[PDB]
Ligand binder design. Structure first.
Ligand SMILES: O=C(O)CNC(=O)c1ccc(S(=O)(=O)N2CCC(c3ccccc3)CC2)cc1F
Ligand SMILES: [Zn+2]
Length: 111
């Protein structure tokens, strides 16, 4: 079972966030329109990491975590009323975010 993040009840989300619509996303740093991760601190939309077999993206979301420390990201296209795929860069694991509806509503997203 995925464990609840240590950040789920303490996450600081930045002021004056930009709204995120329900589709049309692109990585800000490359052409990818799939495997995109919404950082829950700042609403950045950046591609997933590259793996040893060539799978995955161009590491833009994990690069962004390394620059900012902003720990949680949600995989766009996985959000339903019951949850989403949430990764914690700080905790090195997929995690549950019981505050995900609040965190997504910060960006105008209705789970
Ligand atoms: O990429 C981002 O910026 C944000 N996400 C992540 O860092 C992330 C990290 C780990 C996981 S994992 O442990 O489930 N696993 C997902 C399959 C991976 C795999 C790759 C090649 C062949 C077989 C398996 C191994 C890691 C899922 C993730 F989404
Ligand atoms: Zn990218």
């Amino acid at each position: 079972v995925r464990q609840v993040s240590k950040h789920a009840f303490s996450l600081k989300q930045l002021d004056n966030p930009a709204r995120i619509p329900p589709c049309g996303w692109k990585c800000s740093k490359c052409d990818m329109r799939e495997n995109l991760w919404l950082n829950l601190t700042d609403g950045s939309i950046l591609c997933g990491r590259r793996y040893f077999d060539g799978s995955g993206g161009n590491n833009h979301a994990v690069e962004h975590y390394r620059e900012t420390g902003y720990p949680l990201a949600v995989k766009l296209g996985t959000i339903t009323p019951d949850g989403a795929d949430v990764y914690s860069y700080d905790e090195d694991d997929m995690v549950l975010d019981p505050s995900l509806a609040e965190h997504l509503s910060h960006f105008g997203i209705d789970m």
